[PDB]
Amino acid sequence: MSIVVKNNIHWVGQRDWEVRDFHGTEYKTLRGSSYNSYLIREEKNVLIDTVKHKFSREFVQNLRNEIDLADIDYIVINHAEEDHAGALTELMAQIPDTPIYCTANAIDSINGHHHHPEWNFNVVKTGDTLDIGNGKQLIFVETPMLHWPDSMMTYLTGDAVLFSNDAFGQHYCDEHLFNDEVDQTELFEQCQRYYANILTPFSRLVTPKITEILGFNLPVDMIATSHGVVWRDNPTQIVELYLKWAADYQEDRITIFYDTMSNNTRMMADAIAQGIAETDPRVAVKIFNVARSDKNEILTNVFRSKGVLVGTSTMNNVMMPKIAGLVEEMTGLRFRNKRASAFGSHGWSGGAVDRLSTRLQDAGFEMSLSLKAKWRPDQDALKLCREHGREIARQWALAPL
Amino acid sequence: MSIVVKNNIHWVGQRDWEVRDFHGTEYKTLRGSSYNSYLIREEKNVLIDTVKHKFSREFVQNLRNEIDLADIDYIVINHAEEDHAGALTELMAQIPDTPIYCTANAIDSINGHHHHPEWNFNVVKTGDTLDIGNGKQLIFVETPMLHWPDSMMTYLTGDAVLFSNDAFGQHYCDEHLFNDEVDQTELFEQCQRYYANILTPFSRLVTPKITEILGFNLPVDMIATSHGVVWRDNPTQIVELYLKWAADYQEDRITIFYDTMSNNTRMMADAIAQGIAETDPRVAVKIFNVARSDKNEILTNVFRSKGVLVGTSTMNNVMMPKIAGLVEEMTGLRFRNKRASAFGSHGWSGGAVDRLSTRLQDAGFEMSLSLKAKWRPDQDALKLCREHGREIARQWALAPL
Ligand SMILES: Cc1cc2nc3c(=O)[nH]c(=O)nc-3n(C[C@H](O)[C@H](O)[C@H](O)COP(=O)(O)O)c2cc1C
Ligand SMILES: Cc1cc2nc3c(=O)[nH]c(=O)nc-3n(C[C@H](O)[C@H](O)[C@H](O)COP(=O)(O)O)c2cc1C
Ligand SMILES: [Fe+3]
Ligand SMILES: [Fe+3]
Ligand SMILES: [Fe+3]
Ligand SMILES: [Fe+3]
Numbered sequence: 001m002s003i004v005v006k007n008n009i010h011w012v013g014q015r016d017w018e019v020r021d022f023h024g025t026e027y028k029t030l031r032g033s034s035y036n037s038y039l040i041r042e043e044k045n046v047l048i049d050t051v052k053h054k055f056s057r058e059f060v061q062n063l064r065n066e067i068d069l070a071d072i073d074y075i076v077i078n079h080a081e082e083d084h085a086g087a088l089t090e091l092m093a094q095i096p097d098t099p100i101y102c103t104a105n106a107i108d109s110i111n112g113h114h115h116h117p118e119w120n121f122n123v124v125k126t127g128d129t130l131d132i133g134n135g136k137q138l139i140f141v142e143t144p145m146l147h148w149p150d151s152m153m154t155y156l157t158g159d160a161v162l163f164s165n166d167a168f169g170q171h172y173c174d175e176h177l178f179n180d181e182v183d184q185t186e187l188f189e190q191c192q193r194y195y196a197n198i199l200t201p202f203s204r205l206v207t208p209k210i211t212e213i214l215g216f217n218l219p220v221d222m223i224a225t226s227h228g229v230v231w232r233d234n235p236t237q238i239v240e241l242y243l244k245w246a247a248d249y250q251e252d253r254i255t256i257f258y259d260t261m262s263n264n265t266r267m268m269a270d271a272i273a274q275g276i277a278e279t280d281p282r283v284a285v286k287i288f289n290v291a292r293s294d295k296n297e298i299l300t301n302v303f304r305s306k307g308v309l310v311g312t313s314t315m316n317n318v319m320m321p322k323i324a325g326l327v328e329e330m331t332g333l334r335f336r337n338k339r340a341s342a343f344g345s346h347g348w349s350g351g352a353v354d355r356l357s358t359r360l361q362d363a364g365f366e367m368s369l370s371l372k373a374k375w376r377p378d379q380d381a382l383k384l385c386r387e388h389g390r391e392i393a394r395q396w397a398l399a400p401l
Numbered sequence: 402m403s404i405v406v407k408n409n410i411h412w413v414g415q416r417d418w419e420v421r422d423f424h425g426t427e428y429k430t431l432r433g434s435s436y437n438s439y440l441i442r443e444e445k446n447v448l449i450d451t452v453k454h455k456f457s458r459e460f461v462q463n464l465r466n467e468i469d470l471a472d473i474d475y476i477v478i479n480h481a482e483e484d485h486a487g488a489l490t491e492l493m494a495q496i497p498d499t500p501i502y503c504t505a506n507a508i509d510s511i512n513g514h515h516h517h518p519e520w521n522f523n524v525v526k527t528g529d530t531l532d533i534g535n536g537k538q539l540i541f542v543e544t545p546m547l548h549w550p551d552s553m554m555t556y557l558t559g560d561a562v563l564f565s566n567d568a569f570g571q572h573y574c575d576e577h578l579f580n581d582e583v584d585q586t587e588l589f590e591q592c593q594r595y596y597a598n599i600l601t602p603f604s605r606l607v608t609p610k611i612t613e614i615l616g617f618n619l620p621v622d623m624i625a626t627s628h629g630v631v632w633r634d635n636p637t638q639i640v641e642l643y644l645k646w647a648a649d650y651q652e653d654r655i656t657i658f659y660d661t662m663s664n665n666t667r668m669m670a671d672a673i674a675q676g677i678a679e680t681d682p683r684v685a686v687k688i689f690n691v692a693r694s695d696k697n698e699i700l701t702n703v704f705r706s707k708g709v710l711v712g713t714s715t716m717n718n719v720m721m722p723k724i725a726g727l728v729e730e731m732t733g734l735r736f737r738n739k740r741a742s743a744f745g746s747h748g749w750s751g752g753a754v755d756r757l758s759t760r761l762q763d764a765g766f767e768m769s770l771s772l773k774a775k776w777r778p779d780q781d782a783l784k785l786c787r788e789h790g791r792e793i794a795r796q797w798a799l800a801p802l
C-alpha cells in the first residue's frame with residue numbers, strides 16, 4: 001500500500017533496493033534508494049512529484065489503488081530530474097488536463113525530457129500559495145541551483161510539512177519511512193555521502209537559502225524529502241547538519257589516494273601516512289587506491305578532510321587516467337579551504353607529479369611542495385617520504401604542536 | 402617441464418592463465434599472458450630474462466630441474482620491468498657472482514627495483530658480442546624507449562633467434578609455444594591490442610630501429626619474445642605488422658565513445674553514427690559507453706580509426722571524469738593523423754563540450770566543429786545530430802563521394 005505520513009498525507013512512492021548506480025556510474029548507491037512521492041487529500045487532492053521512469057507502470061497503478069486519477073486536482077513538481085519526474089508522461093497520458101505547478105526553469109527541464117509543452121504548467125515563485133481546503137495551503141519556495149535551476153520546495157501549512165525534494169534527502173532504502181525508525185549510523189553515512197558528492201559545489205547557496213526560509217517563520221513538524229526517510233523526530237537535525245557541512249566543512253583529517261602500476265607510489269603513500277601519524281596523533285588518516293576503491297567514499301573523505309595527498313606514477317609522460325578523472329570531478333565539486341600535496345614515482349624524466357600538482361591547484365587546493373621518487377623507494381627514499389609526512393603534518397596543523 | 406624452442410634453446414618461463422590486470426588496471430589481459438625466459442646451453446650456459454616476482458619460487462625451482470644454478474654462466478636482461486626481471490633477486494641470492502649483461506640504462510632500472518648494486522653488471526651496446534661456444538655468439542642491439550630506456554634485444558647467431566623481449570610480443574596464454582600452433586585470430590587481436598595500448602607513442606622510433614636491425618643482415622629463423630608465442634613460421638610477419646602499425650596507422654573507421662548520466666548523450670551518439678553510415682558505407686563504426694566498456698578495446702579501435710567522436714554531458718560545469726581520464730591517456734599515447742569532434746548534452750549553461758574539444762586538440766586530434774544539445778534530443782534535435790554525422794562523414798572521407 002501507500003503509507004500515511006501525517007493526517008491526510010500519503011506516501012505513494014517507490015523503494016529501490018536494487019539500484020547501485022546514479023548519474024551514470026558517478027554515484028554508487030550501496031544501500032539502494034527510494035523515490036518519494038506524496039498524495040495530499042483535503043478538499044483538493046495534490047500529488048507531489050512522481051518516481052523514476054523505470055517504475056512508471058507500478059507508480060500509476062499503485063496511485064489508482066489509492067485514488068481515482070481524475071480526482072487528482074494539482075500536480076506539484078519540485079524538481080524535474082528523471083528520478084522524480086520520470087513517470088510524468090505515463091501519468092499525464094491518463095490525466096492531460098491536470099495542472100502542473102513548478103518553477104519557470106522547470107518548464108524548460110520538464111519539456112526538455114518529456115517533450116509535452118502542451119501540458120498545463122503553472123509557474124510558481126517564492127511566496128506563492130495554493131489553497132487546498134480545510135484551512136490548509138501550499139507555500140512554494142524557489143531554490144535555484146540546489147541542486148538544479150528548476151529546484152524548489154513546497155510547504156504545507158497546518159500539518160507543517162516541508163516537501164524539500166532532494167534537499168536533506170539521502171539514498172537509503174528501508175521499509176520504515178521515518179528517520180527515528182531506521183539505523184542512525186547508516187542514515188548519517190548516506191546523508192553525508194549525498195551532500196559531499198552532490199551539494200558541495202553549491203555550499204555558498206545553502207546557508208543564505210536556509211536563512212531565507214527560516215525568516216518565513218514556518219513551523220516544521222516533518223521534512224518530507226524525495227529520497228530516503230521522512231524526518232519527523234527532531235527534523236531540523238538534518239538542517240543543522242547542512243549548515244555545518246556548507247561552511248567549508250573540514251575535520252582534523254587527511255585523505256591520501258593514488259594510482260599505481262607496480263606499487264612504488266603505494267610504498268610512498270604508506271610512508272607519508274606513517275610520518276603524519278607519528279607527528280600529529282590528532283589527525284585521522286585514510287588511504288585509498290583509486291583503481292580498487294569506492295570513488296564516492298574517497299570524495300566523502302576529501303570533503304571531511306583538512307587536506308589531501310594525491311599520488312600518481314608517470315605513464316607516457318602524463319599522469320594515470322583514474323587520477324586525472326578524479327581530479328576533474330574534484331574540479332567540479334569545488335572543495336574550499338583545503339590544502340594538497342602531489343607525490344609519486346617515476347622511471348626517468350617523470351613529469352606527472354608536477355602535472356598533477358598544477359591540476360589540484362586548478363581544482364582549488366592550496367598546494368604544498370611535491371614529493372618525487374625514482375623507481376622503488378629504498379630505505380633512504382622511504383625516510384624522505386616519511387619526512388614529507390612530517391612536513392605536511394606540521395604545516396597543516398590546526399593548532400600548534 | 403621446460404620446452405625446447407630450437408636445438409639447445411629451452412623455454413623456462415611461466416604461463417599466466419589467471420592474470421587480468423597489467424600496469425595497475427590500465428591494461429586488461431582478457432586472454433592471460435606468459436612470461437618467457439630462455440636457457441641456452443652450448444659451451445656456455447646463458448639465461449635470458451626471468452619472470453614476474455609472483456612466480457619467483459616456481460621459476461628458480463623449475464630452473465633447478467633443468468640445470469644446476471652454479472652452471473649458469475651469463476644472465477641477460479633485455480628489459481628490467483617487473484614481469485621480466487622480477488625473479489632476479491631470488492635467483493641472484495643463489496648465484497651472486499653470476500654476471501649480468503644489460504644496457505647502461507638497465508643498471509639504473511635493475512638497481513631501482515632490486516637495490517642490489519653489488520651485482521656484477523656488464524654494460525652492452527649495439528654491436529657488442531658474447532661468445533657462448535660451438536661457433537655461436539650473442540649479439541646485442543640497444544632499443545631505447547622501445548618501450549623503456551633500458552630496453553634491448555639479443556640475437557643468437559647460428560640458430561638465428563632474435564630475443565626481442567617486449568617487441569613483437571603479446572599477452573596471449575597458450576600451452577603451445579609457437580605461433581603456428583595457436584588461434585591466428587586471437588593472436589592477431591592480442592598483438593594489435595598490445596601495440597595500440599603500449600607502443601603507439603613510440604611509433605616514430607619503431608621504423609628507424611627496424612630499419613637499423615635489417616641493415617645488420619642477420620638471418621631470422623625465430624623471434625622469441627618475452628610475452629606470448631614464439632614466432633617460427635614466417636616470423637617476420639609480426640615485423641611487417643609493426644611497420645604498418647607504426648606509420649600512423651588508420652583504417653576507414655570511426656570510433657565513437659562517451660559517458661552519460663541520463664542517456665541524452667547516448668541518443669546523440671546513435672544518431673551521429675546513423676548519419677555517418679548512411680553517408681559513407683565504406684566507414685566502419687563502433688560505439689562505446691566508457692563506463693560500461695573495455696577501455697583497451699576502445700583505445701585499440703581509436704588506433705585503427707581515421708577519426709573519433711567523443712561525447713560527454715556537463716556535470717558541475719566540467720566533463721564526466723571517465724572521459725577526462727580517457728582523454729588524458731590518449732594524450733600520452735600520441736595518436737597521429739587523426740581527426741576528432743566533441744559532442745554532448747547539457748542542462749543550462751553547459752561548457753563540457755568546449756572543454757572536451759580543447760583537450761582532444763591537446764591530445765593531438767585535428768578538431769572539427771562540436772555538436773551540442775539541450776536535455777533529451779527530440780526529433781528535430783536528432784535530425785541535427787544525424788546531420789552532424791553527415792558533416793563528419795563527408796569531411797573525413799578518404800576518397801571523394
Ligand atoms: C606503461 C609505462 C609507461 C611509463 N612511462 C614513463 C614515462 O613516461 N616517464 C617516466 O619517467 N617513467 C615512465 N614509466 C616508469 C614508471 O613511472 C616507473 O616504473 C614508476 O617508478 C612506477 O610507479 P608505480 O609503481 O607507483 O606505478 C612508465 C612505466 C610504464 C609501465
Ligand atoms: C549531477 C549533475 C550535475 C549537472 N551539472 C550541470 C552543469 O553544471 N551545467 C549544465 O548545463 N547542466 C548540468 N547538468 C544537467 C545535465 O547536463 C543534463 O541533464 C544533460 O542533458 C544530461 O546529459 P546525459 O543524459 O547525456 O548524461 C547536471 C546534471 C546532473 C545530474
Ligand atoms: Fe536531483
Ligand atoms: Fe533526486
Ligand atoms: Fe615492458
Ligand atoms: Fe613485458
Ligand SMILES: [O]
Binds near residue numbers: 082
Ligand atoms: O534528483
Ligand SMILES: [O]
Binds near residue numbers: 480482483484
Ligand atoms: O614489460
